[PDB]
Amino acid sequence: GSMAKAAAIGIDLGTTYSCVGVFQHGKVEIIANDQGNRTTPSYVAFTDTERLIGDAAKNQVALNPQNTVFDAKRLIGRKFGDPVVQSDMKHWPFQVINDGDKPKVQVSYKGETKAFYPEEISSMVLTKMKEIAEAYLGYPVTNAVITVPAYFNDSQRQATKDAGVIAGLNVLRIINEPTAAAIAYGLDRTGKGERNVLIFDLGGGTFDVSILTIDDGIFEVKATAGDTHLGGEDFDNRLVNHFVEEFKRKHKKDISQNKRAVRRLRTACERAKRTLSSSTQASLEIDSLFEGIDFYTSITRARFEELCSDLFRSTLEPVEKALRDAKLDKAQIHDLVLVGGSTRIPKVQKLLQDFFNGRDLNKSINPDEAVAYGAAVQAAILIKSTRAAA
Ligand SMILES: Nc1ncnc2c1nc(Br)n2[C@@H]1O[C@H](CO)[C@@H](O)[C@H]1O
Ligand SMILES: [Mg+2]
User: Could you tell me the distance, in angstroms and rounded to a whole number, from the CA of residue 178 to the centre of ligand 2?
Assistant: First the structure.
């Protein structure tokens, strides 16, 4: 009669990390990759012998900075001359070249100099997400919903579809990341009447606030605001500067010029930062950090909170701006949704909850997984082909 249909997948194609989910048996499964990670770095590395994608690419970045590409989402659908592109290039160790006013990333790969369009790098990330899904399902996957930021224009949206097509995926739809997070909580299934939803998205490098109105399952983007210079990496930087000073006081040595020592310090700081989201203190233990000196220390959550206090408070400025742009008062917001790993920070949660006068935050779906979760819910809906009964 009719053969069973393969499940469709939902992909959050993120700037720093990507996530894939599938809706089956009335629920979403966020799919771990073969290293057991529920999110995969949006990294692609090139060597004389291999092309590495995801954890394998990110784990070798220290010694191969020129041929390990990340942040392609900051280049996708943009012109080489765009001022956003020109500023970002100063922070990247890989080469970005101008091909007819379109940026391309240029690397050494398999004995040659090769240049790739941002959509080609994103297609490599999407091929890895497709393979992660097929390893779990045990069959080939064809259909996918891919998410994008709400501020993406037509060119950025078309380049994302192009990346999906290069990866061999049929793109069912390009959906907005804040809409996908709202879908994850079933906020479009609450019936008749208007609901105002605020999505608070704090990433590794950027902060986005979106206000959506949902009426009978129809979404309208009312306002977007944010800070392009606010993210998890800024909190890591504050801990790095703190521990560099601490080593200076304790051992009368400045480590800041040994890249390996700074990198080992930063790696430890990011892990300590994650521990501090569940514990009131965290240990830092690095062996032979500099000049054979072992660095065994600690940091309280209170000290970390003080170190990043101004940065955490600054997340409320785009919230107030978005509310002014949407022409809404804070009491008129029905639902608050958290997106991004940095939203696990207790102080960030407390500041936002205090701003909305004690209101509960939707954070039950892992914030680094909510976008893929909603994309998987939508993908299963889009492939339905029910014929009405008489
Ligand atoms: N539990 C957590 N507590 C604090 N921060 C976290 C946590 N988990 C993740 Br993931 N992050 C940060 O989220 C960003 C994602 O690009 C990075 O800056 C991560 O360090
Ligand atoms: Mg995201």
Answer: 9
